[PDB]
Write a protein that binds this ligand. Structure first.
Ligand SMILES: CC#CC[C@@H](C)[C@H](O)/C=C/[C@@H]1[C@H]2C/C(=C/CCCC(=O)O)C[C@H]2C[C@H]1O
Lengths: 270, 11
């Protein structure tokens, strides 16, 4: 029995390490920057078209060395961010015991359905009520500025902010969040899985770790685990609606081409 | 063959 709780504790630690090794941004780094003690050079704030063009000239000059409409340039930046996060999540996923042992097609499927849920979960770490860190911690873009973009672009982020304000009130730390992201990835009920029985067991193992970790790490909040279970179902719906919105953009905006990796993830998703 | 398959095999 001690051999088991020892392995549960150990597994929680190893997932936390894989998370620290693989993601460029985490909640601790984001709060340092935001606090914001004591980074030498604080984030450029982007709150209107002028500050956006300034940030662009210094932070992604290529995209403006040419130019497309502001809303489209921001959408391109969003995509580049998602592509990089997808790459980070892939490596994190391969560090989870048993993931890399799965059928390549089951791995693809867990990632396909999991990445955007994990992305919006982790996005919360860089969001407060006023805005969100962007460009690897070097800029901060305001919620109001995003809302002010023309339709449909102004509809992208608000729902993510709304999710984040509630997720953030849970006061999770990175050790909590690494496990949550692991449980999102190892999900037995993704559409089209081959070896469902094995993955359900893997899922149950991870959730067991998460449940015990939350018990140790948050003894003040006895309902924390059912709360997270609900957040997972919320993320599922948040992602369904995001993809619906993405399809609308792709279909009606002549100048907003989807990156090929992201089209692959979205294809036949929901 | 797919981009995701490639990412998964990348390393
Ligand atoms: C300048 C600037 C800015 C803001 C961005 C750089 C910010 O860094 C982006 C964060 C994006 C959000 C905005 C999204 C748009 C969907 C389109 C891409 C997708 O469908 O992946 C999805 C969210 C995921 C995250 O990568």
């Amino acid at each position: 029995e001690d051999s088991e709780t020892a392995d549960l504790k150990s597994l929680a630690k190893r997932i936390y390490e894989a998370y620290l090794k693989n993601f460029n941004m985490n909640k601790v780094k984001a709060r340092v920057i935001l606090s914001g003690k004591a980074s030498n050079n604080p984030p450029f704030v982007i709150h209107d078209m002028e500050t956006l063009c300034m940030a662009e000239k210094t932070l992604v000059a290529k995209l403006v060395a040419n130019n497309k409409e502001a809303e489209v340039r921001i959408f391109h930046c969003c995509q580049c961010t998602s592509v990089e996060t997808v790459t980070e999540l892939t490596e994190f996923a391969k560090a989870i015991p048993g993931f890399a042992n799965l059928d390549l097609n089951d791995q693809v499927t867990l990632l396909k359905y999991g990445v955007y849920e994990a992305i919006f979960a982790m996005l919360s770490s860089v969001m407060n009520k006023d805005g969100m860190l962007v460009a690897y911690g070097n800029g901060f873009i305001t919620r109001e500025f995003l809302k002010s973009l023309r339709k449909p672009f102004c509809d992208i982020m608000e729902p993510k902010f709304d999710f984040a304000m509630k997720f953030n009130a849970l006061e999770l730390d990175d050790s909590d969040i690494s496990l949550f992201v692991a449980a999102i990835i190892c999900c037995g009920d993704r559409p089209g899985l081959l070896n469902v029985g094995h993955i359900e067991k893997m899922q149950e193992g991870i959730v067991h770790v998460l449940r015990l970790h939350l018990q140790s790490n948050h003894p003040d909040d006895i309902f924390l685990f059912p709360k997270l279970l609900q957040k997972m179902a919320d993320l599922r719906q948040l992602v369904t609606e995001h993809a619906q919105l993405v399809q609308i953009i792709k279909k009606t905006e002549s100048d907003a081409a989807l990156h090929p990796l992201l089209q692959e993830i979205y294809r036949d998703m929901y | 063959l797919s981009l995701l398959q490639k990412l998964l095999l990348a390393t």
